[PDB]
């Protein structure tokens, strides 16, 4: 693969409290137009859940995590971050960073398909 990505942080988390999810990017990295996570939560299909623009660190959220989670990037260091704040017992889930080398418009920027490139999955669990 031209990009690997590697996620870090997760487990455990009180409702209302935070975790930082991380993803390391590497190869070919000046590229990468978007970083993005994505989770599984139980029985559920994946979902976008916060897309950010590399060029300019716009971010797009699923509604459902809107004014709850933040996406971030480091791009010396080719990172992504996931700040989960104000955590509710319907995040728990696999939480998977996945990145992308072509550009797609903004409407299709929580879509799994315009994602070329995935993390390893991290388990968040949520305790009331």
């Known amino acids: 693969s031209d990009v690997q990505l590697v996620e870090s942080g997760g487990g455990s988390v009180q409702a209302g409290g935070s975790l930082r999810l991380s993803c390391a990017a590497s190869?070919?990295?000046?590229?990468?137009?978007?970083m993005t996570w994505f989770r599984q939560a139980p029985g559920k299909a994946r979902e976008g859940v916060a897309a950010?623009?590399?060029?300019?660190?716009?971010?797009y959220y699923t509604d459902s995590v809107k004014g709850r989670f933040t996406i971030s990037q480091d791009k010396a260091k080719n990172m992504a971050y996931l700040r989960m704040d104000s955590v509710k017992s319907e995040d728990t889930a696999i939480y998977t960073c996945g990145a992308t080398r072509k550009y797609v418009p903004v409407r299709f920027a929580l879509d799994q398909s315009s994602y070329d490139y995935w993390g390893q999955g991290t388990q968040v669990t949520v305790s009331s």
């Open positions: 950010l623009y590399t060029h300019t660190g716009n971010t």
């Open positions: 190869g070919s990295t000046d590229s990468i137009e978007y």
